[PDB]
From a paper:
The tip of each stereocilium is linked to its tallest neighbor by a ‘tip link' filament essential for hair-cell mechanotransduction. Immature tip links are likely formed by homotetrameric protocadherin-15 (PCDH15) proteins, while mature tip links are made of cadherin-23 (CDH23) and PCDH15 heterotetramers. CDH23 and PCDH15 are unusual members of the family that feature 27 and 11 EC repeats, respectively. Here we present the X-ray crystal structures of repeats EC8–10 and EC9–10 refined at 2.8 and 3.35 Å resolution, respectively, which show an EC9–10 calcium-free linker that alters the linear arrangement of PCDH15's EC repeats.
To understand the role of non-canonical tip-link EC repeats, the human protocadherin-15 EC8–10 (PCDH15 EC8–10) and the mouse EC9–10 (mmPcdh15 EC9–10) fragments were refolded from inclusion bodies produced in Escherichia coli and used for crystallization and structural determination. The structure for mouse Pcdh15 EC9–10 (3.35 Å) contained 228 residues starting from Met 898 to Glu 1,125 (in the most complete protomer of the four found in the asymmetric unit). A structure of mouse Pcdh15 EC9–10 (without EC8), crystalized in a different condition and space group, shows the same unique features. This suggests that the EC9–10 interface is robust and that the observed features are not a crystallographic artifact (Supplementary Discussion). Sequence analysis indicates the absence of canonical calcium-binding motifs in the PCDH15 EC9–10 linker across different species. Consistently, the PCDH15 EC9–10 region shows a calcium-free linker that is bent (∼90°) and breaks the linear arrangement of EC repeats. In addition, the PCDH15 EC9–10 linker has structural features not observed in DNcad, Tcad or any other cadherin structures. A unique EC9–10 310 helix is located in the middle of the EC9–10 linker (His 1,007–Ile 1,011; blue arrow in Fig. 1d,e), and an atypical EC10 FG-α loop (Leu 1,091–Asn 1,105) form an EC9–10 interface that stabilizes the observed bent conformation of the linker. In addition, EC9 and EC10 have unusual and unique structural features involved in bending, namely an EC9–10 310 helix and an EC10 FG-α loop that form part of an interface that keeps EC9 stuck to EC10. Also, unbending was not observed and the end-to-end angle and distance were stable throughout both simulations. This suggests that the EC9–10 repeats are bent in solution, spontaneously and occasionally transitioning between two very similar bent states. Overall, the data presented here strongly suggest that the bent, calcium-free linker in PCDH15 EC9–10 plays a relevant mechanical role in hair-cell transduction.
Residue numbers in the entry: 898 to 1125
The structure:
């Protein structure tokens, strides 16, 4: 019998593509498996696009039948920041032939317009534990072609001990620091292009994320002695 359909690994895939991408530019691979006995038609999954609800994405993208790679059907000329919903259907060679669908949300964006930091690690001089709010700690720097850069701290600042000026990329002291509580931090930072920020999006990659090693400088204050 053939009584199990293909089941996509994910319900919604993501993927990027340049706005001027040539024909057959690879975007992403989708994937689905079939629970019927292996080696047979019933569990032999082919991939196809669909144009019921989203015919235009289907007009410019296509999925390969056997590999599952999503690619450009045409040399494209679409506008940046756009998001398309391409609908992919995986179907078996069974009897009766079963299937299931899934969505590939594709982002139209240039790779070269994603920012690049000046360093992957920033090691600024050690900040006094008694430093006041607003005391500058260090500064981070990132370029991108035809792009102004918004900076953000994305991880490692769980204590809200730091803030960053989201435009100058200047990291500063937000809460008061205690050396005895914690002697060092490592922030994950992220430069995103302004055009991207405006479309309510973030696009991380190796070159638009960097680390900041902050070192706390001990002064004579009241040491915490015991806790609980
Ligand atoms: Ca099947
Ligand atoms: Ca202290
Ligand atoms: Ca101290």
């Amino acid at each position: 019998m053939n009584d199990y359909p293909p089941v996509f690994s994910k319900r919604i895939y993501k993927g990027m593509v340049a706005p001027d991408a040539v024909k057959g530019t690879p975007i992403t691979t989708v994937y689905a498996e079939d629970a019927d006995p292996p080696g047979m038609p019933a569990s032999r999954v082919r991939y196809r696009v669909d144009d019921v609800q989203f015919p235009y994405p289907a007009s410019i993208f296509d999925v390969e039948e056997d590999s599952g790679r999503v690619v450009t059907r045409v040399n494209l000329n679409e506008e940046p920041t756009t998001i398309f919903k391409l609908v992919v259907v995986a179907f078996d060679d069974g009897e009766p032939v079963m299937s299931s669908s899934a969505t590939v949300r594709i982002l139209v964006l240039h790779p070269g317009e994603i920012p690049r930091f000046t360093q992957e690690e920033y090691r600024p001089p050690p900040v006094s534990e008694l430093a006041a709010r607003g005391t500058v700690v260090g500064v981070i720097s990132a370029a991108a072609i035809n792009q102004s850069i918004v900076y953000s701290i994305v991880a490692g600042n769980e204590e809200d001990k730091f803030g960053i000026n989201n435009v100058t990329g200047v990291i500063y002291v937000n809460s008061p620091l205690d050396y005895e509580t914690r002697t060092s931090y490592v922030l994950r930072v992220q430069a995103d292009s302004l055009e991207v920020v405006l479309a309510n999006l973030r696009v991380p990659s190796k070159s638009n994320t960097a680390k900041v090693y902050i070192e706390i400088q001990d002064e004579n204050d009241h040491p915490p002695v015991f806790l609980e």
